[PDB]
Amino acid sequence: DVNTLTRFVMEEGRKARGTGELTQLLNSLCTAVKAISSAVRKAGIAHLYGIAGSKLDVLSNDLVMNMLKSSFATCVLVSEEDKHAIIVEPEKRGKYVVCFDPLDGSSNIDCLVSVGTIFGIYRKKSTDEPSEKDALQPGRNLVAAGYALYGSATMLVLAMDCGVNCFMLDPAIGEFILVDKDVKIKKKGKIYSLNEGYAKDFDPAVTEYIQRKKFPPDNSAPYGARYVGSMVADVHRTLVYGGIFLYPANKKSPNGKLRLLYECNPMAYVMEKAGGMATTGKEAVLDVIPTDIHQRAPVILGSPDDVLEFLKVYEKHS
Amino acid sequence: DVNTLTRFVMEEGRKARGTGELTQLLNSLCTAVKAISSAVRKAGIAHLYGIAGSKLDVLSNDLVMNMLKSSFATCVLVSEEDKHAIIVEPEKRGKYVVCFDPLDGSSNIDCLVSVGTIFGIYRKKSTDEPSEKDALQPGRNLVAAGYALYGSATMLVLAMDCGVNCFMLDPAIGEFILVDKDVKIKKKGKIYSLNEGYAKDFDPAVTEYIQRKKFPPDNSAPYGARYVGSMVADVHRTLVYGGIFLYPANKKSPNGKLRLLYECNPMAYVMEKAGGMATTGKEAVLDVIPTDIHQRAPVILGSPDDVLEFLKVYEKHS
Amino acid sequence: DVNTLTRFVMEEGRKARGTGELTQLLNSLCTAVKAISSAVRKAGIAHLYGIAGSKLDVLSNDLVMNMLKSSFATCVLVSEEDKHAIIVEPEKRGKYVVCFDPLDGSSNIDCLVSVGTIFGIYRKKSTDEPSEKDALQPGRNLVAAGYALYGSATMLVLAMDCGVNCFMLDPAIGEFILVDKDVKIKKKGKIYSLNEGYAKDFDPAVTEYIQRKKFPPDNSAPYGARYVGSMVADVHRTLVYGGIFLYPANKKSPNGKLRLLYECNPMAYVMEKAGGMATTGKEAVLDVIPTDIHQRAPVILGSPDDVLEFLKVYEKHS
Amino acid sequence: DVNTLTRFVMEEGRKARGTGELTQLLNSLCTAVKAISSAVRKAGIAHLYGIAGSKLDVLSNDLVMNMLKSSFATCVLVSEEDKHAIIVEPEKRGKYVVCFDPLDGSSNIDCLVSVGTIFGIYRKKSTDEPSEKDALQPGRNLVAAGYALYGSATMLVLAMDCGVNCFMLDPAIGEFILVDKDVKIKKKGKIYSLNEGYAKDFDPAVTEYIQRKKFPPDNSAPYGARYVGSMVADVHRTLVYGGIFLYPANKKSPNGKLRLLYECNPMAYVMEKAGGMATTGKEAVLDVIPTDIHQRAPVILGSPDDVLEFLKVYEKHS
């Protein structure tokens, strides 16, 4: 049969027999994502350019922020665009905390590079008056996670207890159509993605691991390399074709470059649910316990075999 | 004021007081790109997944192929998807030879990677019955050229005698708005783009040049690295952000992998018009004379300072 | 705050605490309407005219039909396009019966006149295997009714226990936006609607009533006249501006022309929910008991005052 | 083959070999209609309802007004929305005068009724400073005229010296696809269109005519009655299905309700270029010399045979 994000979600709801909040939460995220998408493809740019006579980062955040509060199922929201965690008014409070990057990669949206949105959904654990504390939970506590990629087409990838599901947006009818049910990442891929410009600053294990793909020790064929620069773009390619995505610590700080709460955990969750791995070299991303909401983390994720190899080598130099 | 692609071309047309063929030619190509873009963003994908009850490479090709023959401005079309050159029917012949790649990067559209259309437009030179011999001209003969980028937004870059112009597609009204008049490229960028997988097969000049970006001799900051794997994308970022794009010759062949007529020349011609550089290592891309319509050619292009720098290193190993 | 059909429907579900079926049903319904609208506005008409090189009544029905079956919330469906009731396969059965008119007004879609979709939702009462017998319920047993109007813009009017609501489709984000809460009709309007072509065949009661409009007895001001030809459009105009719509019996037969199950029952129901009136002249449309699923029925709906005037002039002739 | 509005016009302009102005005039107008159409189908209504967190007549006027000015082909512009005629700056002056109704039927856009843009293009005769005077020309002097219809689908009808042509707007690729070449209207139809709420004030000549439609003298079949209440729609129907449209003089004034400059003339011009007829009862609409740019005129247009019958009756009462 044919299936859509709303139908897929609704059903999962029924089976689950819950409160309905998550179904309502996820749905708002959905409307937001499309609204966002509408703007990213330059909806009515003509109007701004005087067709009638007379920032996208911020708008994206307002959409998401506003659609969630209206959901009535949120209490604490964190966004790569806000200094502190936004605390939802008493009248519209729910039981879920949402951590998200409204439009990741925006900085490079000038060259029409693929940009995306990332979201992670937790269930508030404590009974205290909401605060940012409710957002400092380990990726391992995620209820649902996913991202929307505004590429050649707009795709939304949702990961839940069941597994990962890929929906494509039919812009003609504003509907997310299921085009990939219960995904599973290749055991081993042949493409590695990482900014090799930071080479002079890599640790020796990352340096060796790279050498290992350029010049396979077992004289196998060398891996291919791709690096969009946009996390969602790169991570999604790694899910589809398999492979390995790296953004390890270096000179910036052994604390890594990507954010834990709304970039790392979310993807790790999706990766792990698809059957891959997502580590920091020292432990599992999802096992890492947040301290501050914009806290960074090193990330290595992709096909199981690849991540394990990296770790094999990481142990070597440890 | 506010201008569109059509209006833009129309005023240039009145200025030069020509026949109007090129104007029509460009318009057809324009509607062709709008068609392609609708397809790429998955317009009516729901009707393909049973909403009513019951390739993107060929679809795009048919679109360009049809559109152009309909304009009455062409006589010889050369496409990446077609083996031989299509010789237009005698009732729809014009005085223009068009070479193009309807959908580049098409081989990786699975991961929703950006894709683009590339096109070069020549003026049939001889008076002989139209044959593929008519597409065997050097890029320096180009009359107009450019590409379409189906990324986050849909942009069309048109390079002609006058300059390089960027037009954004307001999907809401299917119209191309000028957003960047007479574009020029930085003198020196800070990003290098090539596939570092083939490292085992890079020729030393390319190997050493890459070493210097990672470990700059003058201890300056190292360049950043990016590689989408789609020519339109990478080349467009190079134009917008400045920098250097590499696809040199090695083992595959002393000729590189990209094809001369519908990939290099157009891209090399846009660069040069934007005041940039495009070389094969031994000569300017626009100066190489074609032997066959599918002829391959090595390419290195981008900011002058960076292209010159590479050429300095290339010279060191010759 | 802002609200959409989906969010409005989900919170109604949460109030009522039910199985969730009717929610998926409306939702399934909502999707079909966006797709029908998409096609009605001629989505990709370019392609059928050869832009690439080489029915609406049917499609509308196919969509609705296929989306409803997929909801898992229906057991028997009735369409003005199918002669026998359709019994949903056992694997997709729900507890609801849906009688609808995919695209009413179609015949005249050649002139681009407005058109629409009418739908009525009944709950199954008996336990006998589903048959068209479960579709012969008086309009008075409707659980939910509604219609979509593909006019200058696309609107969806949903009527339920709680009353009437209007939603506008935002084509850019594929979302239905609530723009009129708990709609109530005027007590008295200034427009009468009917095809004055069948004048030579009007029964006296109707010929007198029309006189009363063109030459008001109390010498008040004459009512205006409007007849689109598309019921959905007429009735909607009536509901919004107030007045009286008439499609009474005559030579054709003391049954009128319109269908009771999927044309009159839904409008009449929406009307009585808006505080208006809808009679056949002998009784109330909703009180009429069906014998055949394609049974015709006389209709007069609109502002309470205007409708009562008819009934008074109707009694003067009985 | 396949053709677009822009291709059509460019081919007409190349044939004739004019100055090119008319060609830009047309495409500028085309662009406005696409924009209007977008706003009419409620492009981004979601935003104004707070999906982000925080007049259609006027806008339509600003789009046409600006696009025409920005064309460099006009000198005098008459609009229903402006009291005086707008005299184009001396820098953007062209040799054409354009009258138009930015969005006829807007007063009723509440019920979602069909609406449309009407336009007429006169060439400026004199060498005098452009003024309101230059728009005072007889329909007989039109150069191009047409109208956009925002019904169930958006179509633009263009009538010129060569004939009448209908273009269907394919909202997916943002282009107008020619779907009806050299249109011609039925010699006779079966639908009469007029507001019968004014029966009380009709003159006898018109009352008798309406009588012969309900009770045909040659006991033929009665004509159908259709009145949408929006000129563009009642006229487009007449043009597509044949029949006759009436808006004769009444109590309002022996001059009628419709405006001659931007409502009657255009319509009148299409009817005649399509075989039809347009009269004020006393003379061909296209032969009336205007005194004021907002001058009104009685109109009866449609199929020849139908209009002549009216004219036969009209004389019987003169």
Ligand SMILES: COc1cc(-c2ccc(OC)nc2)c2oc(NS(=O)(=O)c3cc(Cl)ccc3Cl)nc2c1
């Ligand atoms: C189709 O509409 C419905 C009906 C029911 C529902 C729940 C209980 C019940 O009583 C037995 N009857 C209906 C729902 O419960 C829920 N619970 S929930 O928290 O939103 C949820 C959503 C998802 Cl993606 C996955 C798991 C869960 Cl846990 N959604 C529903 C949607």
Ligand SMILES: COc1cc(-c2ccc(OC)nc2)c2oc(NS(=O)(=O)c3cc(Cl)ccc3Cl)nc2c1
């Ligand atoms: C309004 O659109 C017009 C009017 C005229 C045109 C040409 C001569 C003329 O004689 C007075 N009057 C008008 C055009 O000529 C041309 N010539 S052309 O070959 O297509 C052309 C297109 C471009 Cl991108 C740039 C230069 C030239 Cl060379 N396009 C026209 C478009």
Ligand SMILES: COc1cc(-c2ccc(OC)nc2)c2oc(NS(=O)(=O)c3cc(Cl)ccc3Cl)nc2c1
């Ligand atoms: C998607 O959100 C939800 C949650 C619940 C639901 C029901 C019980 C419960 O236990 C606390 N928690 C949630 C629903 O029940 C229903 N019942 S229902 O039959 O579909 C329905 C839909 C509408 Cl338009 C109006 C009344 C009713 Cl009767 N829809 C739900 C949607």
Ligand SMILES: COc1cc(-c2ccc(OC)nc2)c2oc(NS(=O)(=O)c3cc(Cl)ccc3Cl)nc2c1
């Ligand atoms: C799109 O390309 C072209 C080329 C030429 C054009 C004109 C003269 C010329 O000299 C040989 N070469 C080219 C045009 O002239 C015109 N003249 S015009 O006034 O705009 C016009 C437009 C239409 Cl709808 C119909 C008749 C006329 Cl009269 N449009 C052109 C468009």
